[PDB]
Enzyme design. Sequence first.
Site, mmCIF file in Angstrom:
data_model
loop_
_atom_site.group_PDB
_atom_site.id
_atom_site.type_symbol
_atom_site.label_atom_id
_atom_site.label_comp_id
_atom_site.label_asym_id
_atom_site.label_seq_id
_atom_site.Cartn_x
_atom_site.Cartn_y
_atom_site.Cartn_z
ATOM 1 N N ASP A 81 118.889 -26.726 -41.287
ATOM 2 C CA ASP A 81 119.084 -25.317 -41.626
ATOM 3 C C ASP A 81 120.496 -25.060 -42.125
ATOM 4 O O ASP A 81 120.698 -24.268 -43.051
ATOM 5 C CB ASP A 81 118.801 -24.402 -40.430
ATOM 6 C CG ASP A 81 117.324 -24.111 -40.252
ATOM 7 O OD1 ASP A 81 116.494 -24.664 -41.011
ATOM 8 O OD2 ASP A 81 116.988 -23.326 -39.344
ATOM 9 N N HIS B 205 106.238 -17.968 -32.825
ATOM 10 C CA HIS B 205 106.540 -18.804 -31.670
ATOM 11 C C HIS B 205 105.347 -19.016 -30.757
ATOM 12 O O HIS B 205 105.294 -19.994 -30.012
ATOM 13 C CB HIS B 205 107.713 -18.220 -30.871
ATOM 14 C CG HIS B 205 109.042 -18.427 -31.530
ATOM 15 N ND1 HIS B 205 110.244 -18.158 -30.910
ATOM 16 C CD2 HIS B 205 109.357 -18.891 -32.762
ATOM 17 C CE1 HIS B 205 111.241 -18.446 -31.729
ATOM 18 N NE2 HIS B 205 110.727 -18.892 -32.861
#
Lengths: 32, 49, 365, 365, 73, 74, 49, 241, 96
Positions: free
Chosen positions: D214, D187
């Site tokens: 996803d 991240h």
Amino acid sequence: FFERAFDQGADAIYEHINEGKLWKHIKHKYEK
Amino acid sequence: ANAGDFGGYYCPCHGSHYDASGRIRKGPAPLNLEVPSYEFTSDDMVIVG
Amino acid sequence: NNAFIDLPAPSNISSWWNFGSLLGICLILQILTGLFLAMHYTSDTTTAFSSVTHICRDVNYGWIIRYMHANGASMFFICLYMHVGRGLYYGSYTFLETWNIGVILLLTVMATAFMGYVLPWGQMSFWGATVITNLLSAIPYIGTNLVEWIWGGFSVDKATLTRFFAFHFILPFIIMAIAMVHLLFLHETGSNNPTGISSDVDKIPFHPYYTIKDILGALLLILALMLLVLFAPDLLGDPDNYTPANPLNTPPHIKPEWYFLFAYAILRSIPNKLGGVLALAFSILILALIPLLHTSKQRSMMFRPLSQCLFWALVADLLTLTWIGGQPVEHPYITIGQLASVLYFLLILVLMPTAGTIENKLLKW
Amino acid sequence: NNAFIDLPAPSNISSWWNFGSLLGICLILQILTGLFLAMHYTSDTTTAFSSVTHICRDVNYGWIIRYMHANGASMFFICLYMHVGRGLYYGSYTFLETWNIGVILLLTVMATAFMGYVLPWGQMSFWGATVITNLLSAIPYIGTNLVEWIWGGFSVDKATLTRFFAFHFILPFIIMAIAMVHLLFLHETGSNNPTGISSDVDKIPFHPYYTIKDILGALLLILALMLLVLFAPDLLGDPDNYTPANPLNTPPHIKPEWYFLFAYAILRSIPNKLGGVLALAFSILILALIPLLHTSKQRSMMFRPLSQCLFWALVADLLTLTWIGGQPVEHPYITIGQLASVLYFLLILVLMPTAGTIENKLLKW
Amino acid sequence: RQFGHLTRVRHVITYSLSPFEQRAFPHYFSKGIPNVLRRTRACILRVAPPFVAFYLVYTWGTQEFEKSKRKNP
Amino acid sequence: RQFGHLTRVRHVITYSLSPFEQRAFPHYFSKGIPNVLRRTRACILRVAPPFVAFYLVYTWGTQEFEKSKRKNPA
Amino acid sequence: AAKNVVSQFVSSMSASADVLAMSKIEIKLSDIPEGKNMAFKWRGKPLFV
Amino acid sequence: SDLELHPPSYPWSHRGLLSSLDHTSIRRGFQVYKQVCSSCHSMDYVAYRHLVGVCYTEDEAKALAEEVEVQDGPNEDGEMFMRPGKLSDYFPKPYPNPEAARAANNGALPPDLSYIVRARHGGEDYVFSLLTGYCEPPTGVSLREGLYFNPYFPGQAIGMAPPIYNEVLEFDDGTPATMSQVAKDVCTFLRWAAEPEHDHRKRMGLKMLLMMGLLLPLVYAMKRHKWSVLKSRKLAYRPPK
Amino acid sequence: HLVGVCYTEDEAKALAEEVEVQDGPNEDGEMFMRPGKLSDYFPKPYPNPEAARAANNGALPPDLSYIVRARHGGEDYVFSLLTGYCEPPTGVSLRE
Ligand code: HEC
Ligand code: HEM
Ligand code: HEM
Ligand code: HEM
Ligand code: HEM
Ligand SMILES: C/C=C(C)/C=C/C=C/[C@H](OC)[C@@H](C)[C@@H](OC)[C@@H](C)CCc1oc2c(O)c(OC)cc(OC)c2c(=O)c1C
Ligand SMILES: C/C=C(C)/C=C/C=C/[C@H](OC)[C@@H](C)[C@@H](OC)[C@@H](C)CCc1oc2c(O)c(OC)cc(OC)c2c(=O)c1C
Ligand SMILES: CCCCCCO[C@@H]1O[C@H](CO)[C@@H](O)[C@H](O)[C@H]1O
Ligand SMILES: CCCCCCO[C@@H]1O[C@H](CO)[C@@H](O)[C@H](O)[C@H]1O
Ligand SMILES: CCCCCCO[C@@H]1O[C@H](CO)[C@@H](O)[C@H](O)[C@H]1O
Ligand SMILES: CCCCCCO[C@@H]1O[C@H](CO)[C@@H](O)[C@H](O)[C@H]1O
Ligand code: FES
């Protein structure tokens, strides 16, 4: 009309594909 | 068996007293001891279940 | 780091603030000794008890790991009760999120220790598992179904022990995660202190001040744990668990682990099944109500004499309940236990909140 | 949220970026089915295998939970290899921290799957435990001592199975924590993309774009898993593990789980004990060297034709090694396996870095 | 990383339609297939060769193994 | 929470000595004991009573239990 | 799908087929003297006669 | 020898993806195991109760169990004793231990058959081929006493003599008991014994396929719907000049 | 377990050889008897608790491995019990 219909219809198809092979199909020959 | 104030039974966990019939007489238990299905046989015995 | 080093901390917290770290240490110690015990323990009812004797007799230092785990559980509770006591006395419960997570932690540790006690499959193990799981049978209509579902059968048996090993293994790690959340919420506000007054005008770095105090505390905790393990390993235990489980016979003087005695006394005081189980549950869940019962204009009991007396009366009462939980259900203990049970709830629900209002009027606000 | 919702994501990542989430799903699937299997499994060598047959024959839906766990392990590796392949091809390894944690994750999952395979105590279970632990005996002076320490004796026996259950139980949770760190490091930079070029000028919200992709991926993974579980549950397994462990007899055609075959072939290619073990270790650890071997001025292989050819040669070679690992140690397989093993290291250490430099010169930089 | 602090962009205009105003599968086949063919022809020369090699080594090796165990190869 | 952003304080002076310039146990007993006595005497009236009650209830209850089990000539 | 999967796992914790294999039990009454409470193991639970 | 003969693929009625086992065949197969194989092979993981609702009624299975005597106890005197079998009992073991099994079979150990079909490459194709594949040794092959030539067994020398032949038993339904028929039925029974979940997984499989046939296209449509905003967007670069 | 505690290894080996313990099965699949050895656990006087009760008028002599830890009073209790038998007091009548 999903889980009931879906389950019954699928079971029906399964039993049809396997007609005469399942215990529920020959059970009567041995069984109040 | 044979403990408690009614000659029946006494449960040591929280003080339940039962009589010789298995009926609850004192303490926290809510019901009489359960009675299962059974039949006596021709050989003097008893078949439970 | 922001869990240590430059974390601002009140300059005046006392040793009663040491129990948080001691709890973390107890948890790590339990996890470590536990993992090592799990490397030799087998959960089959035919081999459970034997595997524990094998640990204590043939595994190198198996005995010290085993007794450190057993007594560690006891140190865990001593610390838990001191920790909660500190919270109540100083009004730390006003940190609602931290406090409520705390209540969840208390309940989870209790459940974890219960299941752990069942693993060696001794007499106390088997009957504890029987009685505690049956608490659910008090639930109307489905209670019985829930119990048999948990047991995996119509009675405590093989299926029960195997799943309890699994639950006991994982729960402590869940507890660790929850504990970290407990701390994340506390860091948002920082610690409370004995006066209950904000300490923002006098904070000091966590390190070196509390890092050294925490180490000293850790040493004392270890001293207390090892005095038990090396000089009196069975002192806080029950002789009956040294006897293999016998499903046809409940020991005549059976009693709960010491840290469950006060709760046992409360449940035993009510000659009604559902009533006793509800009282049992409330004896712990009432902690979540404390914040709502706070009437004082001041946070801590430090400056509240009446509240203090009542607080110590509550401690004396828990000691009373602990004593009663260890006695047979006979006169005069039955009445003392009932009075002690009533006082417990009367103190928390009525007397303390009332004293807070009285103290408020005495100070004119 | 800062792990979903408004997370900026490249507008152009392809399905090769779906494997990270599929890996998370595989891990949760394994943990859930695993916990339920642990509720019935016993680790005593006399009852291990029987407890597994008990799960599959008498526990309600025990068979589906068992085979989902077994095949779930296979899906886990398929996803791992696709995930690593994506990283290599696109130069994602330049995120050094994320990548190195990634290497640790791969090694930990391999260790976890190995120990899990040992639990049912079948023939493959016992000999896999024997061979893999003995890899440590290659360590000079203390190797043998380390092996016996791990076994808890002079051979694989009771003490071994019990500790393997304990290690297999806890490692997956450690993997979960490590995976969260893997993501925290990622991240900080955000995702790489097919072009290898910074995508800061064209980011889109993770939600709804990739949350929906996803989910679609999750569905396909579940389809693949259940096709195996419901129509071919033993397809990817070994018949020999359906035979209880026999310490006096090693099956004549013994072979590793399919996802370990390439490494097995590499080790088998070297007629020296220490040499084979070193090659085995290097076959995985070389991943940690890839970042240092990057010579190209461009991050991804998308615009590098020569590198691409070598990349696919490396994939074809791993497929070659997988095939060889499943064949007997006989001519001509011995030579093919040795050539394939050499090519593996030659491609990574020499050919790819060299192609990068050649490509650089062709572009005049 | 957060929208608003990513990078500097100037003079770019982007036009978009609500998903409800458009088709989800515009020219799915009349264009999808042609692009798939383009993408396939575009990579096959890089991807396929190594596997053709695998295929060859496999068939040769397997047949070689067989012949080697017989009486008269 | 971070030093520099806690709260506002003005006009306060604090003086301190290095730990190496001072005693770690200044007047440990000549003052420690007197303060402990002060703190003890200051709380005992709040703390002790409840436990004295416990003690009484305990001794009375225990002795009562004993007496109750002794043969009552009938 | 979710309801089915969840109930299957929950179901796995219920009594397994071998536990429901039960069966009755025959008891010899003569072996039990007057005044004696005899405990027998019937389904992991005590059975008093 | 090191030569290998792999079994061919027989068209078992349960071969197909949605094809269940033939339960009448399972029933006959059980009879073969009971009358023939059980004298040497154990089936430790199957119990009489497992047969109920599969190939025998509960009353029939109870009757089958009562045909044998199993040890139980200890009794009040601390003695072990014999009793009629019951539904909860597992099939009787022909030997108390593998040592005795080998001693009774010239050193060879008849393996437990509970999972034999899953424990062997080829499954029932292998077992059927093995059972119906005994033949005389090829010229030049000489087997030590106690060993039989079977082209399907690894090495070709097996310690089990041909266990079946025409009329080795009489079936309860009159089916002609030819060697091939007996093998076909016992192999089917062995498939059930190794994978009792067989029929149910396939039924669940059909439902899984029907559900995925529904959900996948729908979720894919959701994906395309959301992405259409990006797929049709257009860009323009207008730098000041 | 006796070795290095109250007996030498040779003495303990000799104590173990005083008993015959079952072992096997052998190559014929038979169980057999052999001299005990250091690894064997102390012989059980009965094959099961049912037999133990049958030989002790229904009473079950408990295993003594942990008796001292399994009883409040420990050795004080066991010693008092062992040396404390006396005749029943007046009014007390014990069954056979
Ligand atoms: C004792 C007289 C036997 C009877 C009756 C049957 N079998 Fe047997 N079987 C026996 C032995 C001693 C062995 C060991 C053979 C060896 O050399 O290892 C076997 C083995 C099998 C096997 C395993 C073959 C393998 O791949 O290892 C199978 C699948 C087998 N037997 C099946 C089987 C069946 C179904 C039977 C009844 C029809 C049967 N056997 C009878 C001894 C005896
Ligand atoms: C596994 C158990 C627990 C752990 C590891 C833990 C740990 C901690 C730590 C480290 C602190 C800071 C130091 C301290 O003040 O002691 C803390 C504070 C606190 N904890 Fe806990 N705790 C646990 C359980 C609980 C319980 C059972 C409660 C209450 C029901 C609770 C309530 C609080 C509160 C209110 C504070 C703030 C104290 C203050 O600043 O005055 N904790 N805890
Ligand atoms: C909150 C942490 C824990 C608590 C409070 C706890 C408590 C207990 C208790 C009370 C016992 C019984 C001790 C006895 O008298 O024998 C026990 C047993 C056991 N525990 Fe734990 N435990 C904890 C963590 C763990 C962990 C993490 C594991 C495993 C990874 C573990 C493994 C065991 C094992 C194997 C036993 C059985 C052996 C024995 O009885 O000593 N425990 N535990
Ligand atoms: C338990 C295993 C693992 C989990 C759960 C996991 C999960 C993830 C997730 C969720 C992402 C983002 C989505 C994606 O790009 O796929 C990611 C990215 C990444 N992972 Fe993993 N990973 C695992 C193992 C590994 C391994 C074995 C490696 C490499 C040796 C690795 C290397 C990377 C790298 C370099 C990225 C950045 C990809 C990019 O943006 O191009 N991961 N991983
Ligand atoms: C990274 C996750 C995991 C992986 C890759 C994994 C892999 C495996 C493998 C390869 C097997 C052997 C399957 C077989 O052929 O029988 C196995 C067995 C087992 N696993 Fe796991 N496992 C994982 C997580 C877990 C967890 C979290 C637990 C328990 C809390 C667990 C419990 C078990 C049990 C009880 C067995 C024995 C039963 C069986 O063989 O199916 N596993 N695991
Ligand atoms: C699958 C997991 C399950 C079902 C977990 C549930 C846990 C419930 C609670 O924890 C949250 C529970 C442990 C906690 O109640 C608040 C305790 C104070 C209960 C105290 C308790 O202990 C006893 C005990 O230990 C015994 O041992 C020999 C015997 C006992 O009587 C004979 C008791 C008893 O009568 C009580 C009330
Ligand atoms: C206490 C914990 C311990 C000791 C864990 C250590 C784990 C080590 C590694 O994981 C990190 C290891 C699993 C990993 O090596 C990189 C694998 C690719 C090893 C591959 C592997 O598998 C085999 C296997 O599975 C077998 O099964 C029947 C049999 C095998 O030969 C007979 C092998 C074998 O010859 C090799 C090389
Ligand atoms: C710190 C000293 C605490 C008091 C020790 C008493 O401890 C108690 O002893 C009883 C028997 O005497 C046990 O049955 C009980 O389980 C135990 O907790
Ligand atoms: C999804 C396609 C995977 C490749 C199918 C073949 O898979 C292979 O089948 C062999 C024989 O059944 C097994 O012995 C082997 O372990 C397995 O990997
Ligand atoms: C991928 C290239 C295939 C490998 C060809 C192996 O070829 C084999 O090498 C042996 C080495 O001793 C020779 O003895 C044998 O005659 C030869 O056929
Ligand atoms: C398939 C037929 C191959 C012939 C091998 C049989 O061989 C015979 O087996 C007998 C078993 O009772 C032995 O007693 C006898 O000595 C042996 O020669
Ligand atoms: S369990 Fe009998 S009184 Fe509570």
